[PDB]
Amino acid sequence: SSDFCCPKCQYQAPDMDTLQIHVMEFIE
Numbered sequence: 001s002s003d004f005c006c007p008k009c010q011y012q013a014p015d016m017d018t019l020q021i022h023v024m025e026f027i028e
């Protein structure tokens with residue numbers, strides 16, 4: 001995969017930093 005999918009959503013981010021901004025850390 002040329003993307004990083006959010007394990008909480010069906011949303012996939014083109015970059016891992018973008019995904020990190022999407023999730024904005026976790027409760028885990």
Ligand SMILES: [Zn+2]
Nearest residue numbers: 006008009023
């Ligand atoms: Zn998410």
